[PDB]
């Protein structure tokens, strides 16, 4: 693989660039939070007498 | 929408860029990809003519057929310049010499595909009955695009290439090894 | 069902064009087999990804035919060429041929996915429509490459007629002979022409730039819609 790309620097660049703009695009859509969901879910039953 | 709209330019811009990048890797060149990308207009013009002349509209069906038309004319252009480029590189053949030997070797396979596909979509363009609205829309775009792209590309591609080869090289244009 | 039918007609129409050029039953049969193999496989891929058979996937199939048949034509034709440019036997000719284009076919599928994938990414309701085409067409291209690397070469090496160095059926008696004779001369006419366009060139960028402004001109004029209204054989009347 290394020898392949040593003679094909442009092809090496293409992979790196495609990867980069895929990440740029990802950054626009990705949600933002402090944490992901970490609390366990709860269900509550409420009744009145 | 609303919710917002018009995402077309962004996604086709990036589409355009990725295509150029893939072509750069394919040819190990930053400039040669243009001798392929330049053919995009050649199929679009025909798709636009047929649609307009037929009272059709720019819709989903028109968009997808066009991509298909662009795809194929891209594919034809890529194989042409791939043949020209190799002859020069592998063999010694000089610019013109190879551009002409390539385009000549490429003419037949190109015509086989174009006419097979143009004839293929004829049923759609001719469609009447259930869903003929969609069928007509798909067929006439592709038929128009394929025709112009086919006739225009076989002449414009060899051009694109030599103009691009000359504008971005060093030596040279003479036979060699 | 109407789209399935044009799908079948398109395959028949393809077979007839193949025959016009290949002028032989078994050769025309090669690209004619590749098509239904790839298409049917595509249905399998759609199922594996939870897609359904719908107007959009069906039209993706139809458009795929152009891409599919082209992969096959490129493979078979190149062998037919090789064989007439060397007189290599069929089995040997495809081996040489495949080694020559095999890398391009794969490369091209990748550049192509770049033109179809992006629309899998439209947002909202819209997005689900375009996505049906993306996956159908991209999948088909993938399978098409596989088939071009597996079946087509095998089929070429066993079903293709040996061609003698220099033979172009130019000396066949009948329509083909006349067609074969017509195509060669026309080819030279083609090469000649191109030969002259290259001696000039500046005049053709002008032309290109005309075509491009023409293109842009027509584009901004062409109204835009989404999906057409279909006559679905029914309607309603509201009374208030
Ligand atoms: C690597 C080469 C790739 C080349 C690709 C180029 C070919 C594609 C060109 C046609 C694309 C569609 O063209 C453009 O589409 C959008 C919607 O998607 C239209 O936009 C209009 O219709 C849609 C319909 O719901 C709305 O989302 C949009 O808000 C509205 O303004 C534009 O009026 C039209 O001009
Ligand atoms: C070589 C070209 C390849 C492309 C061909 C593509 C064909 C597209 C077909 C789309 C519509 C078919 O729709 C589908 O048909 C089959 C049978 O015909 C039905 O299937 C039903 O019929 C058959 C018997 O007649 C039974 O084996 C099956 O158990 C039953 O469920 C499906 O319930 C229906 O949804
Ligand atoms: C998210 C990751 C991003 C990666 C995306 C991938 C980029 C797209 C690849 C397209 C290139 C086409 O496919 C590949 O291109 C290279 C580029 O010279 C070609 O390479 C070809 O020429 C060289 C010599 O110059 C040979 O050593 C090689 O065996 C041959 O295949 C091949 O025909 C093909 O293997
Ligand atoms: C002299 C080396 C030239 C290599 C060019 C690489 C271009 C990187 C572009 C980065 C785009 C995000
Ligand atoms: C996507 C940006 C790629 C730019 C490549 C430029 C290469 C120029 C070297 C001659
Ligand atoms: C998308 C921009 C690509 C720029 C390529 C420049 C080519 C320079 C070659 C010397």
Q: Which structural category do the helix and sheet elements of chain A fall into?
A: mainly alpha
Task: Please give the alpha-carbon distance between the first and last residues of chain A.
Answer: 74 Å
Beta percentage of chain A is under 5%
Number of helices of chain A: 2
Q: Which chain pair shows the most residues in contact?
A: B-C, 81 and 81 residues
Rg estimate of chain A, integer Å? 24 Å
Helix content of chain A: 40-55%
Largest sheet, strands/sense/barrel of chain A: none
Query: How do the SSEs of chain A run, as a string of H and E?
Result: HH
Subcellular location (chain A): Cell inner membrane
Protein name (chain A): Multidrug efflux pump subunit AcrB
Family (chain A): Belongs to the resistance-nodulation-cell division (RND) (TC 2.A.6) family.
Function (chain A): AcrA-AcrB-AcrZ-TolC is a drug efflux protein complex with broad substrate specificity that uses the proton motive force to export substrates.
List the helices and strands and how they pair.
The structure is cut from a larger assembly and holds 3 copies of chain A.
Chain A: H1 2-6, H2 9-29
Bound molecules: dodecyl-beta-D-maltoside (LMT) (3 copies), dodecane (D12) and decane (2 copies).
One dodecyl-beta-D-maltoside sits between chains B (5-6, 8, 12, 15-16, 19, 40, 58, 63, 66, 70) and C (115, 126, 224, 226).
């Amino acid at each position: 693989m290394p020898n392949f790309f040593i003679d094909r620097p442009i092809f090496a660049w293409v992979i790196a660039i495609i990867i980069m703009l895929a990440g740029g695009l990802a950054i626009l859509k990705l949600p933002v939070a402090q944490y992901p969901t970490i609390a366990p879910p709860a269900v509550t039953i409420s009744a009145s007498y | 929408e609303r919710l917002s709209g018009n995402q077309a330019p962004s996604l086709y811009a990036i589409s355009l860029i990725v295509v150029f990048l893939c072509l750069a890797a394919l040819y190990e060149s930053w400039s040669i990809p243009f001798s392929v990308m330049l053919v995009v207009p050649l199929g679009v013009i025909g798709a636009l003519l047929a649609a307009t002349f037929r009272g059709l509209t720019n819709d989903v069906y028109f968009q997808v057929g066009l991509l298909t038309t662009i795809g194929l004319s891209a594919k034809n252009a890529i194989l042409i310049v791939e043949f020209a480029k190799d002859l020069m590189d592998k063999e010694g053949k000089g610019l013109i010499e190879a551009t002409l030997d390539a385009v000549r070797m490429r003419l037949r396979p190109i015509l086989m595909t174009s006419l097979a596909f143009i004839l293929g979509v004829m049923p759609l363009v001719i469609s009447t009955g259930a869903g003929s609205g969609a069928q007509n829309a798909v067929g006439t775009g592709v038929m128009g695009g394929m025709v112009t792209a086919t006739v225009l590309a076989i002449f414009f591609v060899p051009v694109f290439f030599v103009v691009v080869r000359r504008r971005f090289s060093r030596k040279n244009e003479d036979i060699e090894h | 069902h109407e789209v399935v039918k044009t799908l079948v007609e398109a395959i028949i129409l393809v077979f007839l064009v193949m025959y016009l050029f290949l002028q032989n039953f078994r050769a025309t049969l090669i690209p004619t087999i590749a098509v239904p193999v790839v298409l049917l496989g595509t249905f399998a891929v759609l199922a594996a990804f939870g897609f359904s058979i719908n107007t959009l996937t069906m039209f993706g199939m139809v458009l795929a035919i152009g891409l599919l048949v082209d992969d096959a034509i490129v493979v078979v034709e190149n062998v037919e060429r090789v064989m007439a440019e060397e007189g290599l036997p069929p089995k040997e000719a495809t081996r040489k041929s495949m080694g020559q284009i095999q890398g391009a076919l794969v490369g091209i599928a990748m550049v192509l996915s770049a033109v179809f994938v992006p629309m899998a990414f439209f947002g909202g309701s819209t997005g689900a429509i375009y996505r049906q085409f993306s996956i159908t067409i991209v999948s088909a291209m993938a399978l098409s490459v596989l088939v071009a690397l597996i079946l087509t070469p095998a089929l070429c090496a066993t079903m293709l007629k040996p061609i003698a160095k220099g033979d172009h059926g130019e000396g066949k008696k009948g329509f083909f002979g006349w067609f074969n004779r017509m195509f060669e001369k026309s080819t030279h006419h083609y090469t000649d022409s191109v030969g002259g366009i290259l001696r000039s060139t500046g005049r053709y960028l002008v032309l290109y730039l005309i075509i491009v402004v023409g293109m842009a001109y027509l584009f901004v004029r062409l109204p835009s819609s989404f999906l057409p209204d279909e006559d679905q054989g029914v309607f309603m009347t509201m009374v208030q």
